[PDB]
Every structure is written in structure tokens, then in C-alpha cells.
Amino acid sequence: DSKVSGNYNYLYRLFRKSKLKPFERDISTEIYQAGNKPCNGVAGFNCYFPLQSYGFRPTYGVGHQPYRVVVLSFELLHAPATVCGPKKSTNLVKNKCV
Amino acid sequence: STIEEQAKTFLDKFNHEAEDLFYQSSLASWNYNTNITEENVQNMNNAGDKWSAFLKEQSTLAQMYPLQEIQNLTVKLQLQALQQNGSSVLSEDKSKRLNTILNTMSTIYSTGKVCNPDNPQECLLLEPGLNEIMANSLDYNERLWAWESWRSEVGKQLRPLYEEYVVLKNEMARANHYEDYGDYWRGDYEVNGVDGYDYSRGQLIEDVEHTFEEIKPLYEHLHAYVRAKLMNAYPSYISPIGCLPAHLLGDMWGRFWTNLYSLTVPFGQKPNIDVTDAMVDQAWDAQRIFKEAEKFFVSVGLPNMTQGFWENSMLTDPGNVQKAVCHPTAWDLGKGDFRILMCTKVTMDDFLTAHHEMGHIQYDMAYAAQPFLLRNGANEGFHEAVGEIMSLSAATPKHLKSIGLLSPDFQEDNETEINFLLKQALTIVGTLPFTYMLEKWRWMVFKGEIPKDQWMKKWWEMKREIVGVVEPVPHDETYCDPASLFHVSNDYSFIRYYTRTLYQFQFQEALCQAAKHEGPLHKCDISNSTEAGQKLFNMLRLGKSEPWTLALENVVGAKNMNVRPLLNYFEPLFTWLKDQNKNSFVGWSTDWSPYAD
């Protein structure tokens, strides 16, 4: 995920009015207003674009290099029989009290 | 919202964009410095101009947050570091004229040529040849010629430029509420509103003048010893009760006395430790040196090297054709990218320079978590002191014979210890009067206490009185001997070299008591002790977050700079010199001059 010259295709938000709620997603790109004056949809003084971006380069240190994250989350609402793991059965014998 | 939460939100965006742009510019600069071509010179200049334009725009944007309503001192430190106009408070005409005279003065210093009276087609620059005559020659007349001609041909060109530079710089500094340019320079040591760690700008002068009053009894005995030793190389040219002629001191200005060692060696039949044949005979290369340095640093409890340091650094001179400035520097490109650029041979001075530069690398690795603007030393004297104590500790016979470079027994004698202490005194002690006197002259000139028709008079009166050296030829007000030094004609402050020399020995004595050393101070090795490492790391990790009077206290235990550790370091040499000057005359008289006869 890193290119010499900069991989500017990975964004992240750093300005928001309030903290996110668990498992909430926000993809809006409206202009954050830091002061008390409206700016009506144009950056400038006290109004910032909310999305920054990682300029990934291969000559970075561990801690500034890209890491791929996958989060698995399990769900038990009410269903009787659902996705479950694999088992391995036993051989079937005959002519013996088993 | 007030006005303090908006400054924080501004500082966030600034930090993110500034870090990105600075990494780009530093990568361009490195790519040029390690591989000199023509397109690299422009690929680097574009990034430099982009960075400077971004910095200027953000600096004019940061003015809209008044510094009176900020209560956090970290936010206030960052804003005050970003709000300073510096230049650009002058008109356009005045700024252009100032940059013009700066470039002219630098060019005159760099390309000035002086040649022979008997062969006018043999002209010598300073760098290749004048400070090679002044370093190696033992001819009185040739040294006199090289000393006089450099100041009479190139120094006289710098006077009408320096006179205008002073005025323009004072005008720039007074528009920033600073009273003069010298106060602007002293403003690096200022601390405001910490309630116990404050520091004025006029307090630096008092501190410097009170610490210099205690180095005089050691410098006087060193001066008398060097004088009695020079009265054998140049008989019938030095007076046993007078000052020293300025052209016999070892280099063009007399900044270091280190080249007088062959003349003033105490016991010249005892060669001092130099493990260079053992390195070559044990098959050491440029990587073994840096592995040993990294091992020394990890011994006290400090981290390894970042694994991007071994792949990206340039530790040897690139062979085929890859023209590169071979000057040891530690690079801090940002974003976790630490590199060292140096072209090492297999010697002992390179073995010590490795430790010196890895000290800088460790200091940079320490404070890498601070905000972008708070990533530096506590003041201008901290980084080089931290780098210098490492080469102090790595060069002792105790350390060298634990590596394997000295024979396992190697009984030491006191004569070689005196040799070593004297060789160290010619570089460390011989430069403090020079530095103090030069910066004092510049301060008094910027302040206006020396009118422009008494510059050379006061220069040479102070050189006779404080330093104890006399000129061999009179100099009227058409000369400029200060401007003939690099730091004066190139607009650099000079007091960092004085405070660094004191912080260095304060740090070393503070770290030698945590390692539980017992002998004299010049024998201390802080390796294998994790308490000294922790004391040092407690200061390395701060950066410019806290006042320098606090960062100093975290290692030493005091708030102000002290000179007693230096005299403690040089005590044995002091006793030896005190016994060697029994029939000499300690001191000098400001009346004798080499021409007044």
C-alpha cells in the first residue's frame, strides 16, 4: 500500500463536531466550522476541510507505515442454527455394542 | 469557543501539513547531498521554496489568534514560535538591500584571494592554503605575511558592508520590540511565566561574566605555560611578561590553540593512546564501527537503531562517481526516518565521530513524539553537548581496552594523562576567552556603546585585556578584523560555543555520579550503567516542551549553568601547571607590543 512519491489514496477524518457512536459510519465532506462565523461552503479562516490523508512512502518508520486491519465481530441474537465451525467425525464400526 | 480552542484546531492542521511538506523537502535535500547532479539541485530548490512559502503563509495566518488569551503554555509556545515576523517587517527595498549585502559579504569571504609580494601570480584562497600556512608553518615572517595580508586585502573590503549590515539588522530587530540585534540573539535563552524557572535576556550577560571570572586562574597558567614554551620556538620575539603575538597561535584567528601541541607537549617521549593500527589489524570496517557505537548506546538502556537506519544511511564514500558532501551529519527527515551521512575511514577519530553523531540520532529519536514545532534541543547549546559527552566517554583507555583495541593489561602512567589533559585544554580552555570577547564586542557594537569610529580600538584593547594577545601591526578604522571570521561575516551567533562547553561538563559530572565513578573525572565511562541512561533520557525526551532551566535541572540538579565541573575535570593539569610556573610570571601586561621597540 506504499509508493515512492506518496500514496495519497488513503484518507482519514480529523475534524468532527462530536465523537462517533460504536459502529457508526460518517462519509460526509462538509466544511468544519471552528469559529463562530459561518463560511457557507468554502475553506479559509476557521473553516477546514475535514479529511486529511496519509502520504505513505516506503522510507517511513514502523508506526508511520501502512497497516491493514480486519475486525471480526460475532452476533448472537436469537437464531437456532447458524454459521458454525468445522468438526471431524469418527469411523463407523459394526457388530460391537457401541 | 473563546480563542484557545480555535488556536488548538489551527495548530492541528498546521502540524499535519507541515510534517508532510517538511518530509518532502528533507528527502529532496538528502537526495541531493548524497548524489550531486544538476537536476537534483533544482529538485531540491523547488521543495525548499514550497516549504518556505507554506511557512510564511501559516505564519501570517497565525497572527489572528492573540497571544494574550492563550492559557496553555504548550499552545502558547507553539504560537509564539510561529508568530515571529523575523524579517519581512522591513520595507521591500530595505529587505532586498539587506539580502544583497549579506550575499556580497559571504561571497567576499568565500572567494577572497591574497598573493605573494615577489610573485603576484601565486594567489591563495583561505581554505586551501592560508589556514594551511597558519596551521603548519614555523616561520615567523611567513605567518606574519599570511596574517596581515588576509586582514588587509579581504578584511578592509568588509567594513563598509558591515557598517550598513549593523544598521539594517538593528532596524529589523527594533520593529520586533527587541531594542537591538544583540538582544534579538539573546532572546533564545528567555523564559516567561513558569514561576521559578524564568530567565531574562539581560541575565545571560551577567551569567556569562560571572562564570568567566572563575576560568581566569586556569587560563592564566595555561597562557604562561604556552608563552614559556613559545619562547623557544621563536626566541627574541616573545616577551616573558607580555601578551602573545596574534599570528603565532595556531590558526588564522587564534580560536583554538590545538595546533600548538607539537611545541608545548609536556612529555614528548610518551606517545598517547591511538588505536588505529589495532583496528586495521583486526579487520574492522565501516559497519563494525557503527555496530560498536550502537552497542555502547544500548548498553546504558537506550534503544537500538530504527532498522531504516541500516538500509537508507550512507556509511561509506560511494565509489564510482557519486559526488557527495562528505561531512558527518545526522539526519531527521521526519516520520520515523533517521539517517546518518558520513564517509568513514578506518581510524580512531572516525570511531569517535560515530559516537558523536549517534548521540544526535538518539536525541532526535527521543523527542519524536512532541509537536512539530517543539522538536529541538532545549536551547542552542544542548544538542552538541549531548553529542560531545558520548565521544568524551567512548575514548577512555578503560572503554578501549574492554572492546579489544588495547592490550588487556596496558598499565597507564600519569605522564600520558598529563599529555592528554594538556591536549584537551588547548581546544576546550583556549577558546573560552576568544568566544567571550568576540560575543561581548558584538553585543556592545549592536547596543551602541562602541561608536563606529572606535571599533578597532576597542577590539584590540579587549583582545589585549581579556584574551591576552597583541597585534603585530597597528590597525586603524579602515580594517574590520571581526568580519574576517566565518561566523561574523555570515551572520551567526557565537555564544552557543561558550554555553555548550559548560553544559557538556555539567552533564558529564552529573552522569558520572549516577554511574558511581570513583577516580578523577577524565577517566569516567558511563557504559553499562542504566541509571545514567535514565537520567539522560529524562531530559532527551522533552525537546522544547519545558524551559531549558527545567531540562537542565532534570540531569544536573541546578537551574543555572556552572563552571565548577570544568575546573573539576581539569584539576590535575591545573596542579601540574601551577608547579611548572614556579619561576615564570603568571599574567600579562597590556603595554608591550612587538613593534613598539
Ligand SMILES: *[C@@H]1O[C@H](CO)[C@@H](O[C@@H]2O[C@H](CO)[C@@H](O)[C@H](O)[C@H]2NC(C)=O)[C@H](O)[C@H]1NC(C)=O
Ligand atoms: C544520482 O542521480 C542521477 C541523476 O539524478 C541518477 O542518474 C540517472 O537516474 C535515473 C533515475 O531513474 C536512471 O534511470 C538513470 O539510469 C541514471 N543514469 C545514470 C547514468 O546513472 C543516478 O541514478 C543517481 N544515483 C543513485 C545511486 O541514485
Ligand SMILES: *[C@@H]1O[C@H](CO)[C@@H](O[C@@H]2O[C@H](CO)[C@@H](O)[C@H](O)[C@H]2NC(C)=O)[C@H](O)[C@H]1NC(C)=O
Ligand atoms: C493543554 O494543557 C493540558 C495540561 O495543562 C495538556 O494536557 C496534557 O495532555 C497530554 C496529551 O494531550 C497528556 O499526555 C498529559 O497527561 C496532559 N496533562 C495533564 C496535566 O492532564 C494538554 O495537552 C494541553 N493542550 C494541548 C493541545 O496539548
Ligand SMILES: *[C@@H]1O[C@H](CO)[C@@H](O[C@@H]2O[C@H](CO)[C@@H](O)[C@H](O)[C@H]2NC(C)=O)[C@H](O)[C@H]1NC(C)=O
Ligand atoms: C508581525 O508583523 C505584523 C505586520 O507585518 C505586525 O502588525 C500587526 O499585524 C496584525 C495582522 O495583520 C494586525 O492585526 C495588527 O493590527 C498589526 N499591528 C499591531 C499588532 O500593532 C505584528 O504586530 C507583528 N507581530 C509580531 C509578534 O511581531
Ligand SMILES: *[C@@H]1O[C@H](CO)[C@@H](O[C@@H]2O[C@H](CO)[C@@H](O)[C@H](O)[C@H]2NC(C)=O)[C@H](O)[C@H]1NC(C)=O
Ligand atoms: C559491560 O558488561 C559486559 C558484561 O559483563 C562486559 O562484557 C564481558 O566482559 C568480561 C570482561 O572482559 C568478559 O570476560 C566477558 O566475556 C564479556 N561478556 C560479553 C557478553 O561481552 C563488557 O566488557 C562491559 N563493558 C564495559 C565497557 O565495561
Ligand SMILES: *[C@@H]1O[C@H](CO)[C@@H](O[C@@H]2O[C@H](CO)[C@@H](O)[C@H](O)[C@H]2NC(C)=O)[C@H](O)[C@H]1NC(C)=O
Ligand atoms: C608521576 O608519578 C610519579 C610517581 O608517583 C612521580 O614521580 C615522583 O614525583 C615526586 C614529586 O616530585 C618525587 O618526589 C619522586 O621522587 C618521584 N619518584 C621517583 C621514583 O623519582 C612523578 O612526578 C609523576 N609525574 C607527574 C607529571 O605527575
Ligand SMILES: *[C@@H]1O[C@H](CO)[C@@H](O)[C@H](O)[C@H]1NC(C)=O
Ligand atoms: C537490539 O538488536 C539486537 C540484534 O542485533 C537484539 O538482539 C537486541 O535485543 C536489541 N535490543 C533492543 C533494546 O532493541
